[PDB]
Scaffold this active site. Structure first.
Site, PDB file in Angstrom:
ATOM      1  N   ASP A 192      -0.514   5.458 -17.488  1.00 47.28           N
ATOM      2  CA  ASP A 192      -0.769   4.114 -16.963  1.00 47.28           C
ATOM      3  C   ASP A 192      -1.797   4.084 -15.816  1.00 47.28           C
ATOM      4  OD1 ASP A 192      -0.567   1.309 -16.855  1.00 47.28           O
ATOM      5  OD2 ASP A 192       1.541   1.267 -16.237  1.00 47.28           O
ATOM      6  N   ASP A 247       2.714   5.109  -6.545  1.00 49.74           N
ATOM      7  CA  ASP A 247       4.068   5.448  -6.970  1.00 49.74           C
ATOM      8  C   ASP A 247       4.298   4.911  -8.381  1.00 49.74           C
ATOM      9  OD1 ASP A 247       6.671   6.526  -6.736  1.00 49.74           O
ATOM     10  OD2 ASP A 247       7.457   4.768  -5.684  1.00 49.74           O
ATOM     11  N   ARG A 304      -4.404  -1.212 -10.486  1.00 48.25           N
ATOM     12  CA  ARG A 304      -3.097  -1.734 -10.063  1.00 48.25           C
ATOM     13  C   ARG A 304      -2.083  -0.611  -9.765  1.00 48.25           C
ATOM     14  NH1 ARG A 304      -3.609  -2.576 -15.527  1.00 48.25           N
ATOM     15  NH2 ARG A 304      -2.087  -1.371 -16.735  1.00 48.25           N
ATOM     16  N   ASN A 305      -2.327   0.606 -10.302  1.00 53.43           N
ATOM     17  CA  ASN A 305      -1.477   1.785 -10.119  1.00 53.43           C
ATOM     18  C   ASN A 305      -2.057   2.811  -9.142  1.00 53.43           C
ATOM     19  OD1 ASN A 305       0.824   0.985 -11.657  1.00 53.43           O
ATOM     20  ND2 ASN A 305      -0.331   1.384 -13.514  1.00 53.43           N
TER      21      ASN A 305
HETATM   22  C1  EBI Z   1       6.144  -2.493  -2.508  1.00 53.48           C
HETATM   23  C2  EBI Z   1       5.082  -2.719  -3.617  1.00 53.48           C
HETATM   24  C3  EBI Z   1       4.631  -1.378  -4.296  1.00 53.48           C
HETATM   25  O1  EBI Z   1       5.417  -0.433  -4.365  1.00 53.48           O
HETATM   26  N1  EBI Z   1       3.345  -1.386  -4.768  1.00 53.48           N
HETATM   27  C4  EBI Z   1       2.776  -0.429  -5.540  1.00 53.48           C
HETATM   28  C5  EBI Z   1       1.973  -0.723  -6.670  1.00 53.48           C
HETATM   29  C6  EBI Z   1       1.390   0.259  -7.458  1.00 53.48           C
HETATM   30  C7  EBI Z   1       1.636   1.574  -7.079  1.00 53.48           C
HETATM   31  F1  EBI Z   1       1.059   2.507  -7.861  1.00 53.48           F
HETATM   32  N2  EBI Z   1       2.411   1.897  -5.989  1.00 53.48           N
HETATM   33  C8  EBI Z   1       2.971   0.920  -5.231  1.00 53.48           C
HETATM   34  C9  EBI Z   1       5.651  -3.547  -4.770  1.00 53.48           C
HETATM   35  C10 EBI Z   1       4.667  -4.665  -5.109  1.00 53.48           C
HETATM   36  C11 EBI Z   1       3.850  -4.835  -3.845  1.00 53.48           C
HETATM   37  N3  EBI Z   1       4.023  -3.603  -3.113  1.00 53.48           N
HETATM   38  C12 EBI Z   1       3.268  -3.320  -2.030  1.00 53.48           C
HETATM   39  N4  EBI Z   1       3.293  -2.094  -1.483  1.00 53.48           N
HETATM   40  C13 EBI Z   1       2.530  -1.805  -0.386  1.00 53.48           C
HETATM   41  N5  EBI Z   1       2.553  -0.551   0.178  1.00 53.48           N
HETATM   42  C14 EBI Z   1       3.212   0.684  -0.258  1.00 53.48           C
HETATM   43  C15 EBI Z   1       4.051   0.989  -1.379  1.00 53.48           C
HETATM   44  C16 EBI Z   1       4.426   2.366  -1.327  1.00 53.48           C
HETATM   45  C17 EBI Z   1       5.316   3.181  -2.301  1.00 53.48           C
HETATM   46  C18 EBI Z   1       6.558   2.723  -1.604  1.00 53.48           C
HETATM   47  C19 EBI Z   1       6.180   2.144  -2.921  1.00 53.48           C
HETATM   48  N6  EBI Z   1       3.821   2.835  -0.215  1.00 53.48           N
HETATM   49  N7  EBI Z   1       3.117   1.863   0.407  1.00 53.48           N
HETATM   50  C20 EBI Z   1       1.689  -2.756   0.220  1.00 53.48           C
HETATM   51  C21 EBI Z   1       0.794  -2.748   1.351  1.00 53.48           C
HETATM   52  C22 EBI Z   1       0.266  -4.035   1.404  1.00 53.48           C
HETATM   53  C23 EBI Z   1       0.824  -4.785   0.347  1.00 53.48           C
HETATM   54  N8  EBI Z   1       1.688  -4.010  -0.372  1.00 53.48           N
HETATM   55  N9  EBI Z   1       2.475  -4.261  -1.481  1.00 53.48           N
END
Ligand code: EBI
Length: 296
Positions: free
Chosen positions: A150, A168, A154-155
């Protein structure tokens, strides 16, 4: 079924949950601070994944085992797992904090909004820096016997200092439902994966080419004028994405290399870094998997 606590277990008292980051697969994800997660550092800014209060024991166990895949990785270009709080509730998994969110969200935030001035689109050097970081994280995963399946903007995650890393797993969206077709990310898939459903490091390279296209278009929908069913036929018949407007030929040639119909003709992630290593920031030689003793 069943989670056995290991050396990754961190005491609850060491964790402090603050502001919300966004909704995860198993529950709300918060940002905060952690003690003794990065060696003996008393205060490290962290991302804390939680399990909703109404979830079952099977769901809590599923969350811990799914997150435990990250334990095997130690790369500067892959989002790190720092700790696990499995003893008692709420069930927590401590992760490395990426303040600028996902690469797709970051790229779309760079798009021009009316009348007010806007920053010019990212320069070739800035795009190559992102490319080398994503490719390094991917070369590390491939060397550790993993197939991503994937790989997309977005990832990928963006750090405070703008460093792009492999995000993650299963933490995708929830605002990117349009990027999937029933389950599968068709617009990012290789012709062979659309045919037999088999994914390799070669199909991850195809997806990397689409990531480059996303960087050059500021996260536009690949094959925009085509429906999911039309995308399936177009890609399997040998169709390719058009060269983005103002995209340098150097970056598009790299996309074309990733988009070779034969998976064996596509360059490896190591081969991609090799062609762009001269354009990477001097710090890359000290932090990358490419320059580490592990790459042999
Ligand atoms: C908490 C989450 C996330 O885990 N995003 C995400 C998306 C793709 C990917 F590959 N890894 C994490 C869920 C949806 C939005 N988001 C997120 N995460 C952020 N930061 C973030 C997530 C993580 C791993 C713990 C999950 N570290 N830091 C961040 C900074 C500014 C806006 N956002 N938004």
């Amino acid at each position: 079924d069943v989670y056995v606590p290991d050396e990754w277990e961190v005491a609850r008292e060491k964790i402090t949950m603050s502001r919300e980051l966004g909704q995860g697969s198993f529950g709300m994800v918060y940002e905060g601070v952690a003690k003794g997660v990065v060696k003996d550092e008393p205060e490290t800014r962290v991302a804390i994944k939680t399990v909703n209060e109404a979830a079952s024991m099977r769901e809590r166990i599923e969350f811990l085992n799914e997150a435990s895949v990250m334990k095997e990785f130690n790369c500067h270009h892959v989002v790190r797992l720092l700790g696990v709080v499995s003893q008692g509730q709420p069930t927590l998994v401590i992760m490395e904090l990426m303040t600028r969110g996902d690469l797709k969200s970051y790229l779309r935030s760079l798009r021009p909004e009316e009348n007010n001035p806007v920053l010019a689109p990212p320069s070739l050097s800035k795009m190559i820096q992102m490319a080398g970081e994503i490719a390094d994280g991917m070369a590390y995963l491939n060397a550790n016997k993993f197939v991503h399946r994937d790989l997309a903007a977005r990832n990928c995650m963006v750090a405070e200092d703008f460093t792009v890393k492999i995000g993650d797993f299963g933490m995708t969206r929830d605002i990117y439902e349009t990027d999937y077709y029933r389950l599968l990310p068709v617009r990012w898939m290789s012709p062979e994966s659309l045919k037999d459903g088999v994914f390799t490091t070669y199909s991850d390279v195809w997806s990397f080419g689409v990531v480059l296209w996303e960087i050059a278009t500021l996260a536009e929908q690949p094959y925009q004028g085509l429906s999911n069913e039309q995308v399936l036929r177009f890609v399997m018949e040998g169709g390719l994405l058009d060269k983005p407007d103002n995209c340098p030929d150097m970056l598009f040639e790299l996309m074309r290399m990733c988009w070779q119909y034969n998976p064996k003709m596509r360059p490896s992630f190591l081969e991609i870094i090799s062609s762009i290593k001269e354009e990477m920031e001097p710090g890359f030689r000290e932090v990358s998997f490419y320059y580490s003793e592990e790459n042999k």
